[PDB]
Amino acid sequence: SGAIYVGNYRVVNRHLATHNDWANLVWEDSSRDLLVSSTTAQGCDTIARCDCQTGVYYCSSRRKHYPVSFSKPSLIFVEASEYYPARYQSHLMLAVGHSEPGDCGGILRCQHGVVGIVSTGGNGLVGFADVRDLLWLDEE
Numbered sequence: 001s002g003a004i005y006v007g008n009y010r011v012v013n014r015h016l017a018t019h020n021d022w023a024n025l026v027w028e029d030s031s032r033d034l035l036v037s038s039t040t041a042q043g044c045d046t047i048a049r050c051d052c053q054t055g056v057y058y059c060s061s062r063r064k065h066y067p068v069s070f071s072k073p074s075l076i077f078v079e080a081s082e083y084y085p086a087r088y089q090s091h092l093m094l095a096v097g098h099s100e101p102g103d104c105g106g107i108l109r110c111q112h113g114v115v116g117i118v119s120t121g122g123n124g125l126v127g128f129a130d131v132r133d134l135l136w137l138d139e140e
C-alpha cells in the first residue's frame with residue numbers, strides 16, 4: 001500500500017484504489033496502473049521533473065529504503081496477476097530489487113522529488129509507475 005500526496009491530489013495504484021478514491025476521481029489509466037483522487041487536506045510530497053535513472057525506493061516487505069538504478073519509462077510486458085491479465089503496462093521503469101504484491105504504493109524518489117510508485121515485482125525485479133510526465137499534479 002501507499003500513496004503520493006501532492007497538492008489536493010492522492011496518487012495510488014489503480015488496482016488498490018478505495019471506494020472513496022473512485023467517488024472523488026480526478027483521472028485513472030489502467031494501462032499505467034494509476035489513479036488520482038481529490039483530497040480536502042494539502043499534501044507534502046513534491047514531484048520530480050527530471051530524467052534521473054538513479055534514486056531510492058521504499059520496500060514495505062523489508063521495512064527498508066533501497067538505492068536503485070532504473071530504466072526509462074517504457075512499454076513492458078507484465079505477467080498476469082490477481083489484478084491484471086498478461087499485458088503491456090506503459091510508463092513503467094524496471095530495477096533490480098525485492099517487490100511482493102503488498103509493496104505496491106511505495107515511493108521511488110530522486111534528488112528532485114517523487115519519481116513514481118511501486119507497480120510490479122518478483123524474480124528480484126521491481127517496476128515503478130512513472131508520474132514525472134503528469135505536469136498537472138503541480139497545479140489546480
Ligand SMILES: NC(=O)[C@H]1CCCN(C(=O)c2[nH]ncc2Br)C1
Nearest residue numbers: 033081099100101119120121122
Ligand atoms: N501492475 C501490475 O500489473 C502488477 C499487479 C501486482 C502484481 N504484479 C507484479 O509484477 C508483482 N509480482 N509479484 C509481486 C509484484 Br509487486 C503486476
Ligand SMILES: [Zn+2]
Nearest residue numbers: 050052110112
Ligand atoms: Zn531527479
